[PDB]
Amino acid sequence: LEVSISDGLFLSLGLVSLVENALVVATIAKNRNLHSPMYCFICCLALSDLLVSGSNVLETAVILLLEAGALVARAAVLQQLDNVIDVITCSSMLSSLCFLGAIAVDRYISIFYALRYHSIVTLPRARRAVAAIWVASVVFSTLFIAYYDHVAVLLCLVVFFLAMLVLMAVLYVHMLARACQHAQGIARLHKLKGAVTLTILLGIFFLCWGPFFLHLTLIVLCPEHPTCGCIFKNFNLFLALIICNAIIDPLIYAFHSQELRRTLKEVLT
């Protein structure tokens, strides 16, 4: 099986995505009620999704120009161009995936340390965490693209994805335990939506990122089995799903905010 994702589709999805995430960043920049660590992490997620979509866009443009021959270039200058665009892509992936974790951790502290939340998470600490994520992520993505032929890189990527998975699972399922306990207390005073929300969060997470890390797992564990060959032929589908993350995460995380939507309305007018 092969879902033959065209370069035109990479351009479409990446443009749409960088448009949307740039709107998200403008809407947080313009509304100073959104200058808060939650929306700081949402802005940094939107930036990582912008950079990933833009890096896919730029790579798609370069490859289209080469396929057209509108660019002629030596092998070395294109290899280094590929390295650079791959570092921006991989860093913005690792950063987006980290900011998904950071949003999960911020949300978790906002629930289980609710009273101490603005002591534990602060714009100082938020900006530190953001900087450490991007800086560490450029470090790691440079090491990964330099040593890209070493399986230790692919395993570090997979293990990072799995640590984020077991993290966000522990986290959002504890938040959903406390949601059920609240629902019980509501029922007792008063005389499902959380499950749907987790199915959207963790489903769009796993179903859009996981194909790519499954791919990396098979590149390590299974370089040559034909069913793994079938999965490898779908790698463009898997990147287009990561751009589907860059599309949907604005919707999941940012535009659930009413104050963001209001600022988005005044930004679009």
Partner: peptide
């Protein structure tokens, strides 16, 4: 040389 979308898209 070849320049392909992303990385690790094909084995070895």
């Amino acid at each position: 040389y070849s320049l392909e979308h992303x990385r690790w898209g094909k084995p070895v």
